[PDB]
Design an enzyme around this catalytic site. Sequence first.
Site, PDB file in Angstrom:
ATOM      1  N   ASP A   1       1.030  -1.251   0.028  1.00 17.71           N
ATOM      2  CA  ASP A   1       0.132   0.121   0.118  1.00 17.71           C
ATOM      3  C   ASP A   1       1.058   1.414   0.079  1.00 17.71           C
ATOM      4  O   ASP A   1       1.775   0.784   0.861  1.00 17.71           O
ATOM      5  CB  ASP A   1      -1.173   0.006   0.894  1.00 17.71           C
ATOM      6  CG  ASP A   1      -0.145  -0.544   2.370  1.00 17.71           C
ATOM      7  OD1 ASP A   1       0.578  -1.284   2.681  1.00 17.71           O
ATOM      8  OD2 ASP A   1      -0.181   0.754   3.160  1.00 17.71           O
TER       9      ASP A   1
ATOM     10  N   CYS B   1      -7.728  -2.767  -5.790  1.00 14.59           N
ATOM     11  CA  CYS B   1      -6.882  -3.134  -4.721  1.00 14.59           C
ATOM     12  C   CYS B   1      -7.191  -2.959  -2.878  1.00 14.59           C
ATOM     13  O   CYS B   1      -8.617  -3.649  -3.096  1.00 14.59           O
ATOM     14  CB  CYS B   1      -5.605  -1.914  -4.674  1.00 14.59           C
ATOM     15  SG  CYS B   1      -5.979  -0.143  -5.168  1.00 14.59           S
TER      16      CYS B   1
ATOM     17  N   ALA C   1      -8.192   0.369  -1.930  1.00 14.44           N
ATOM     18  CA  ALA C   1      -9.000   1.390  -1.437  1.00 14.44           C
ATOM     19  C   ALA C   1      -9.853   1.290  -3.428  1.00 14.44           C
ATOM     20  O   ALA C   1     -10.620   2.308  -3.231  1.00 14.44           O
ATOM     21  CB  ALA C   1      -8.218   2.958  -0.920  1.00 14.44           C
ATOM     22  N   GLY C   2      -9.250   0.926  -3.801  1.00 13.79           N
ATOM     23  CA  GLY C   2      -9.360   0.647  -5.531  1.00 13.79           C
ATOM     24  C   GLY C   2      -8.895   2.115  -6.090  1.00 13.79           C
ATOM     25  O   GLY C   2      -9.277   2.690  -7.169  1.00 13.79           O
ATOM     26  N   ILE C   3      -7.982   3.291  -5.776  1.00 17.40           N
ATOM     27  CA  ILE C   3      -7.468   3.868  -6.159  1.00 17.40           C
ATOM     28  C   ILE C   3      -6.006   4.590  -6.219  1.00 17.40           C
ATOM     29  O   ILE C   3      -5.688   4.869  -7.436  1.00 17.40           O
ATOM     30  CB  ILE C   3      -7.643   4.940  -5.399  1.00 17.40           C
ATOM     31  CG1 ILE C   3      -6.910   5.683  -3.639  1.00 17.40           C
ATOM     32  CG2 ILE C   3      -9.709   5.098  -5.338  1.00 17.40           C
ATOM     33  CD1 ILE C   3      -8.266   6.903  -3.533  1.00 17.40           C
ATOM     34  N   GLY C   4      -5.415   4.045  -5.901  1.00 16.97           N
ATOM     35  CA  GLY C   4      -3.156   4.694  -5.643  1.00 16.97           C
ATOM     36  C   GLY C   4      -2.735   3.285  -6.572  1.00 16.97           C
ATOM     37  O   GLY C   4      -2.960   3.685  -7.445  1.00 16.97           O
ATOM     38  N   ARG C   5      -2.465   1.891  -6.337  1.00 18.57           N
ATOM     39  CA  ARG C   5      -2.345   0.430  -7.301  1.00 18.57           C
ATOM     40  C   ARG C   5      -3.151   0.648  -7.758  1.00 18.57           C
ATOM     41  O   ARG C   5      -2.412   0.210  -8.971  1.00 18.57           O
ATOM     42  CB  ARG C   5      -1.694  -0.506  -6.537  1.00 18.57           C
ATOM     43  CG  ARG C   5      -0.937  -0.610  -5.463  1.00 18.57           C
ATOM     44  CD  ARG C   5      -1.129  -1.839  -3.763  1.00 18.57           C
ATOM     45  NE  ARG C   5      -2.615  -0.900  -2.924  1.00 18.57           N
ATOM     46  CZ  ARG C   5      -2.190  -1.784  -2.215  1.00 18.57           C
ATOM     47  NH1 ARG C   5      -1.066  -3.064  -1.184  1.00 18.57           N
ATOM     48  NH2 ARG C   5      -3.516  -1.345  -0.732  1.00 18.57           N
ATOM     49  N   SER C   6      -4.480   0.481  -8.525  1.00 21.72           N
ATOM     50  CA  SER C   6      -5.546  -0.035  -8.795  1.00 21.72           C
ATOM     51  C   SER C   6      -5.060   1.430  -9.915  1.00 21.72           C
ATOM     52  O   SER C   6      -5.615   1.536 -11.017  1.00 21.72           O
ATOM     53  CB  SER C   6      -6.904   0.370  -8.563  1.00 21.72           C
ATOM     54  OG  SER C   6      -7.370  -1.202  -8.291  1.00 21.72           O
TER      55      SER C   6
ATOM     56  N   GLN D   1      -1.915   7.432  -5.351  1.00 17.76           N
ATOM     57  CA  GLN D   1      -1.910   8.182  -4.289  1.00 17.76           C
ATOM     58  C   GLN D   1      -0.300   8.695  -4.187  1.00 17.76           C
ATOM     59  O   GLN D   1       0.268   9.441  -3.037  1.00 17.76           O
ATOM     60  CB  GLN D   1      -2.334   7.364  -3.321  1.00 17.76           C
ATOM     61  CG  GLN D   1      -3.335   6.607  -3.602  1.00 17.76           C
ATOM     62  CD  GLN D   1      -3.910   8.115  -1.936  1.00 17.76           C
ATOM     63  OE1 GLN D   1      -4.041   8.380  -1.736  1.00 17.76           O
ATOM     64  NE2 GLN D   1      -4.924   9.078  -3.611  1.00 17.76           N
TER      65      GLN D   1
HETATM   66  C1  LIG Z   1     -12.269  15.509  -5.029  1.00 19.50           C
HETATM   67  C2  LIG Z   1     -11.721  14.291  -3.649  1.00 19.50           C
HETATM   68  C3  LIG Z   1     -12.607  12.997  -3.391  1.00 19.50           C
HETATM   69  C4  LIG Z   1     -12.333  12.876  -2.406  1.00 19.50           C
HETATM   70  C5  LIG Z   1     -10.747  12.609  -2.784  1.00 19.50           C
HETATM   71  C6  LIG Z   1     -10.337  12.101  -1.417  1.00 19.50           C
HETATM   72  C7  LIG Z   1      -9.038  11.510  -1.487  1.00 19.50           C
HETATM   73  C8  LIG Z   1      -8.379  10.709  -0.251  1.00 19.50           C
HETATM   74  C9  LIG Z   1      -8.319  10.104   0.789  1.00 19.50           C
HETATM   75  C10 LIG Z   1      -8.366   9.800   2.155  1.00 19.50           C
HETATM   76  C11 LIG Z   1      -7.388   8.419   1.666  1.00 19.50           C
HETATM   77  C12 LIG Z   1      -6.482   7.858   2.431  1.00 19.50           C
HETATM   78  C13 LIG Z   1      -7.045   6.358   3.055  1.00 19.50           C
HETATM   79  C14 LIG Z   1      -8.141   5.592   2.304  1.00 19.50           C
HETATM   80  C15 LIG Z   1      -7.158   5.269   1.331  1.00 19.50           C
HETATM   81  C16 LIG Z   1      -6.390   3.628   1.725  1.00 19.50           C
HETATM   82  C17 LIG Z   1      -5.321   2.759   0.641  1.00 19.50           C
HETATM   83  C18 LIG Z   1      -4.666   3.476  -0.548  1.00 19.50           C
HETATM   84  C19 LIG Z   1      -3.903   2.555  -1.360  1.00 19.50           C
HETATM   85  F1  LIG Z   1      -3.095   3.894  -2.076  1.00 19.50           F
HETATM   86  F2  LIG Z   1      -3.324   2.164  -1.144  1.00 19.50           F
HETATM   87  P1  LIG Z   1      -5.081   1.819  -2.770  1.00 19.50           P
HETATM   88  O1  LIG Z   1      -3.721   1.228  -3.550  1.00 19.50           O
HETATM   89  O2  LIG Z   1      -4.977   0.489  -1.944  1.00 19.50           O
HETATM   90  O3  LIG Z   1      -5.788   2.354  -3.197  1.00 19.50           O
HETATM   91  C20 LIG Z   1      -5.484   4.639  -0.617  1.00 19.50           C
HETATM   92  C21 LIG Z   1      -6.772   5.288   0.216  1.00 19.50           C
HETATM   93  C22 LIG Z   1      -6.298   5.754   4.350  1.00 19.50           C
HETATM   94  C23 LIG Z   1      -5.364   5.750   4.188  1.00 19.50           C
HETATM   95  C24 LIG Z   1      -4.080   5.239   4.876  1.00 19.50           C
HETATM   96  C25 LIG Z   1      -4.581   4.206   6.543  1.00 19.50           C
HETATM   97  C26 LIG Z   1      -6.326   4.508   6.265  1.00 19.50           C
HETATM   98  C27 LIG Z   1      -6.569   4.704   4.964  1.00 19.50           C
HETATM   99  N1  LIG Z   1      -8.629   7.542   3.980  1.00 19.50           N
HETATM  100  N2  LIG Z   1      -9.737   7.076   3.603  1.00 19.50           N
HETATM  101  N3  LIG Z   1     -10.013   7.585   4.310  1.00 19.50           N
HETATM  102  C28 LIG Z   1      -9.776   8.102   5.469  1.00 19.50           C
HETATM  103  C29 LIG Z   1     -10.322   9.098   7.065  1.00 19.50           C
HETATM  104  C30 LIG Z   1      -9.379   9.354   7.475  1.00 19.50           C
HETATM  105  C31 LIG Z   1      -7.704   8.824   7.175  1.00 19.50           C
HETATM  106  C32 LIG Z   1      -7.883   8.380   6.579  1.00 19.50           C
HETATM  107  C33 LIG Z   1      -8.303   7.780   4.999  1.00 19.50           C
HETATM  108  C34 LIG Z   1      -6.121   8.988   0.437  1.00 19.50           C
HETATM  109  C35 LIG Z   1      -7.156   9.869  -0.571  1.00 19.50           C
HETATM  110  C36 LIG Z   1      -8.470  12.052  -2.256  1.00 19.50           C
HETATM  111  C37 LIG Z   1      -8.929  12.894  -3.211  1.00 19.50           C
HETATM  112  P2  LIG Z   1      -7.589  13.585  -4.026  1.00 19.50           P
HETATM  113  O4  LIG Z   1      -6.371  13.239  -4.507  1.00 19.50           O
HETATM  114  O5  LIG Z   1      -8.422  14.857  -5.350  1.00 19.50           O
HETATM  115  O6  LIG Z   1      -6.667  15.663  -3.514  1.00 19.50           O
HETATM  116  C38 LIG Z   1     -10.001  13.504  -3.169  1.00 19.50           C
HETATM  117  N4  LIG Z   1     -10.452  14.585  -3.671  1.00 19.50           N
END
Ligand SMILES: Cc1ccc2cc(-c3ccc(C[C@@](Cc4ccc(C(F)(F)P(=O)(O)O)cc4)(c4ccccc4)n4nnc5ccccc54)cc3)cc(P(=O)(O)O)c2n1
Length: 289
Positions: A185, A219, A221-226, A266
Site C-alpha cells: 500500500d 487493491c 481502496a481501489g485508487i492508489g495501485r489500481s 496515491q
Molecule cells: C475530489 C476528491 C474527493 C475525495 C478525495 C479523497 C482522497 C483520499 C482520501 C483518503 C485517503 C486515505 C485513506 C484511504 C486509502 C487507503 C489505501 C490506499 C492505497 F493507496 F493504499 P490503494 O492502493 O489501496 O488505493 C488509498 C487510499 C487511508 C489511508 C491510510 C490508511 C487508511 C485509510 N482514507 N480514506 N479515508 C480516510 C479517513 C481518515 C484517514 C485516512 C483515510 C486517500 C485519498 C483524495 C482526493 P485528491 O487526491 O483529489 O485530493 C480526493 N478528492
Amino acid sequence: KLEFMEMEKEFEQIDKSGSWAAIYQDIRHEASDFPCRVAKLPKNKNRNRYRDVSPFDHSRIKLHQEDNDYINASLIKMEEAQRSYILTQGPLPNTCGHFWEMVWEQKSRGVVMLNRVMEKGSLKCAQYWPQKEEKEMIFEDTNLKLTLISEDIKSYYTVRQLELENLTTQETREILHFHYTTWPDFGVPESPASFLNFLFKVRESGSLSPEHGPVVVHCSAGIGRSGTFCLADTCLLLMDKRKDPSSVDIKKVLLEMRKFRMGLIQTADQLRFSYLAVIEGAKFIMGDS
Ligand SMILES: Cc1ccc2cc(-c3ccc(C[C@@](Cc4ccc(C(F)(F)P(=O)(O)O)cc4)(c4ccccc4)n4nnc5ccccc54)cc3)cc(P(=O)(O)O)c2n1
Ligand SMILES: [Cl-]
Ligand SMILES: [Mg+2]
C-alpha cells in the site's frame, strides 16, 4: 525511431530536477470534484471500506438488485485508448456477494487484485475467493457460487482460474483472477519488469478484450495501485496507437481518469513508476520481438 530518447531525456530531466512531487500535487489540485451522494447515504455506510474514498455518482457501478444498488466501484472509460475498467475497493466481509454480483452483471472476464488480504497487520481486504478447490464459496445474498479450479503461483503474482455460477439462472462462467502479491500500500511494484510482465499476462489472457465486460481492478481502496495499473495500461495503449508516442501526456491521462474516480495514484513515486513502466513497456512493445 530514436523518439524514445526524448521521453527518457524528459524522464531523466524530471528525475534530475526532482519535480515528481510538484507534478503529482499539481495533478491532485486540478483533479475533478464530483458528487458522491449515493456513497454517503447512511445505509451505504457499511459498504465503504474508507470514509473518504467514494465513487462519483456519475460513474459508479450499480448493482441490478432493487433493495440497494450500491457498491464502492467506478467505471473508468478511456475513449481514445478504447478500454474500460471498473475500479473498486477490496471487498469487505459484507460486500463479497455484491462484488461477485457486479462481476457477473458487468460480464467481466477478469479480476485484477493488486493488494493482499493481509497487509502490515491489518486485513485491508476480505478473503472473497476460495483458497481450496474443495471449499467453494456460496454468497447467499446474491445467490452466487464460486469455486477455485486451479492456480498458478509465481514469485511476484498468482493467476487463478475460478468458476462463478449464478445459482438463480444456473449459468457458469470462468473468471480469471490475476493477483499481484508484492505491491505494498502506498508503494510501488518490485520492478518495472515484474509489473509489466504481470500486465502483459493480464492482456494476453483476453480479459481486457472489448468482447468481455470491463476488467475489475482493485487493491485496498481501489485508487492508489489500481490507479497506477490502469494508468500504465491506458498510456501503453495510446503509445502504440499514436504515430508519435512521445505525444502521450501521462499527466493529462491521469487527470482524465480522475474524472471517473477520485485519488487515482496515491504517491509521487507511483506516478514516477507509471512513467518508468510506460516508457520501458513502450520500448518492449515497439521494440523488435
Ligand atoms: C475530489 C476528491 C474527493 C475525495 C478525495 C479523497 C482522497 C483520499 C482520501 C483518503 C485517503 C486515505 C485513506 C484511504 C486509502 C487507503 C489505501 C490506499 C492505497 F493507496 F493504499 P490503494 O492502493 O489501496 O488505493 C488509498 C487510499 C487511508 C489511508 C491510510 C490508511 C487508511 C485509510 N482514507 N480514506 N479515508 C480516510 C479517513 C481518515 C484517514 C485516512 C483515510 C486517500 C485519498 C483524495 C482526493 P485528491 O487526491 O483529489 O485530493 C480526493 N478528492
Ligand atoms: Cl476487510
Ligand atoms: Mg497548470
